[PDB]
Amino acid sequence: MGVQGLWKLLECSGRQVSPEALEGKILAVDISIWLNQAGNSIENPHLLTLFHRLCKLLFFRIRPIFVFDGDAPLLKKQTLVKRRQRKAQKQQQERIAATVTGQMFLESQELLRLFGIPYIQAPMEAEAQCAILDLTDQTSGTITDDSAIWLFGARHVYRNFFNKNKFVEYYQYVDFHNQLGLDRNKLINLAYLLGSDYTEGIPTVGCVTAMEILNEFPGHGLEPLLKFSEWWHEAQKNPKKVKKKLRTLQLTPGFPNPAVAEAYLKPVVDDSKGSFLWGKPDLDKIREFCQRYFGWNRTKTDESLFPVLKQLD
DNA sequence: TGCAGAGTTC
DNA sequence: GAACTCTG
């Protein structure tokens, strides 16, 4: 999820490209959204979609690095819990999804090791790991469809790459900073407004409305939201500019909770500058895996791999 | 599941 | 009249 409408905002700065443009590139990928998602009674669909993607990547000469979600933050859990209160046993559907995912994790990491692709378990948030990889110039981008990566400092992000009718879109920090006037702090304030995976937003704030807010109270860091907060705590009191529209909407009392901006500003990530390695993928083991989990033979997989191994050489 | 247009309200 | 949402 992340910010509810941020992609709509940034689309003016994103450029449509083709998969042939990622040829000379080393990019990070957040697999955690996939297993976060993944009635024909199929076996291991996470692995199925993962395999097809994994092919698509190497076909276009991408050098991937996969990033795995760790312990979700306190604010992420609080957000999903207060999002389920709106929509004894909640603690027993937590410990049954983790043992299913655990196996999904293990199988996916095995598939990766066979394909010769390295990977890193992010200690808490995975988007933050991909972001800090972008920042230290360890990757040359990050393939993800999650807006929240921007708030963790992202500079170059490739979106809609796997979405097949949608064209691959390349987004750059500098581009939408120079066009839209957005920095990391303004985007985090936008996260307070529009709603994100660490905090639900304001009921009626569309994109344009959140920008109207962030311009009505200019400032540095978190000042805009404090000014808007005390202004709405004042103007709500009764004498009964364009600020009337903003009077109308409802606001929470703890707004703004500074722990939210704190979580986006200083997240937890691996600090070391890893030097990464892509090994050669052994063929036989891959067909063995495919039969073990899907039930594919040797020339059922080879019909798919025939372009892939051809491009590898 | 993302965009694009209209419908409904201030 | 324009902007936001909902649905197609």
Same domain, A34 and A61: yes
Task: Round to a whole number and report the distance in Å from the CA of A245 to the C1' of B8.
Answer: 17
Q: Does the residue A287 lie in any domain? A: no
Q: For strand C, which residues in window 193-232 of chain A come within 7 Å by CB?
A: 204-209
Task: Round to a whole number and report the distance in Å from the CA of A252 to the C1' of B4.
Answer: 33
Task: Round to a whole number and report the distance in Å from the CA of A68 to the C1' of C8.
Answer: 36
CB count, 10 Å around CB of A173?
Answer: 21
Determine the nucleotide nearest to A5 by Cα–C1' distance: B2
Task: Round to a whole number and report the distance in Å from the CA of A93 to the C1' of B7.
Answer: 41
Cβ proximity of A286 and A114 under 8 Å? yes
- Domain count along chain A: 2
Same domain, A66 and A136: yes
CA distance A207 to A9: 7
CA distance A28 to A107: 20
Residue A117, token pair as written in the block: 């692709």
Same domain, A27 and A175: yes
Cα A227 to Cα A149, A220, A221, A239: the distances in Å are 27, 11, 12, 20
CA distance A283 to A296: 14
Cβ proximity of A40 and A184 under 8 Å? no
Same domain, A43 and A169: yes
CA-CA-CA-CA torsion sign (A237, A240, A244, A247): positive
CA-CA-CA-CA torsion sign (A77, A79, A81, A87): negative
HEC profile of A219-237: CCCCHHHHHHHHHHHHHCC
Cβ proximity of A249 and A204 under 8 Å? yes
Q: CB within 8 A of A41, min separation 6: which ones?
A: none
Residue-wise burial string across A111-128, b where 16 or more C-beta atoms lie within 10 A, e elsewhere? bbebbebebbebbbbbbb
> Of A129, A154, A181, which one is at a domain's C-terminal end?
A181
Q: Does the residue A271 lie in any domain? A: no
Q: Does the residue A41 lie in any domain? A: yes
- Relative orientation angle of helices A258-265 and A184-194, to the nearest 10 degrees: 130
Residue A163, token pair as written in the block: 């979405």
> Of A161, A181, A201, which one is at a domain's C-terminal end?
A181
CB count, 10 Å around CB of A130?
Answer: 32
Q: Does the residue A52 lie in any domain? A: yes
Residue A176, token pair as written in the block: 């939408």
Q: Does the residue A156 lie in any domain? A: yes
> Of A123, A147, A181, which one is at a domain's C-terminal end?
A181
**Strand-pair partners of A16:** A169
Cβ proximity of A8 and A147 under 8 Å? no
CA distance A254 to A46: 39
Q: For strand B, which residues in window 235-254 of chain A come within 7 Å by CB?
A: 245
CA distance A22 to A139: 12
Same domain, A160 and A174: yes
Residue A247, token pair as written in the block: 């009077």
Same domain, A97 and A238: no
Cα dihedral A16, A132, A281, A311, rounded to 10, equals: 20
Q: For strand C, which residues in window 225-284 of chain A come within 7 Å by CB?
A: none
CA distance A17 to A15: 6
Same domain, A144 and A197: no
CA distance A17 to A236: 48
In strand B, the nucleotides that come within 7 Å of a protein beta carbon are 1-3, 10
Same domain, A217 and A126: no
Q: CB within 8 A of A185, min separation 6: which ones?
A: A220, A221, A222, A261
Same domain, A239 and A190: yes
Nearest to A68 by CA among A124, A25, A138: A124
Q: CB within 8 A of A124, min separation 6: which ones?
A: A70, A71, A72, A73, A267, A268, A269
HEC profile of chain A: CCCCCHHHHHCCCCEEECHHHHCCCEEEEECHHHHHHCCCCCCCHHHHHHHHHHHHHHHCCCEEEEEECCCCCHHHHHHHHHHHCCCCCCCCCCCCHHHHHHHHHHHHHHHHHHHCCCEEECCCCHHHHHHHHHHCCCCCCEECCCHHHHHHCCCEEEECCCCCCCCEEEEEHHHHHHHHCCCHHHHHHHHHHHCECCECCCCCCCHHHHHHHHHHCCCCCCHHHHHHHHHHHHHCCCCCCCCHHHHHCCCCCCCCCHHHHHHHHCCCCCCCCCCCCCCCCCHHHHHHHHHHHCCCCHHHHHHHHHHHHHHHC
Same domain, A133 and A246: no
CA distance A67 to A282: 22
Same domain, A144 and A236: no
Cβ proximity of A67 and A176 under 8 Å? no
Same domain, A35 and A159: yes
Q: Residue A138 sits in which domain range?
A: 6-181
Task: Round to a whole number and report the distance in Å from the CA of A145 to the C1' of B3.
Answer: 16
Tallying the residues shown for chain A, one arrives at 313
CB count, 10 Å around CB of A51?
Answer: 22
Q: CB within 8 A of A161, min separation 6: which ones?
A: A19, A22, A143, A168
Cβ proximity of A138 and A67 under 8 Å? no
Q: Does the residue A205 lie in any domain? A: yes
Asked if strand B comes closer than 7 Å to A145 Cβ, the answer is: yes
Determine the nucleotide nearest to A211 by Cα–C1' distance: C3
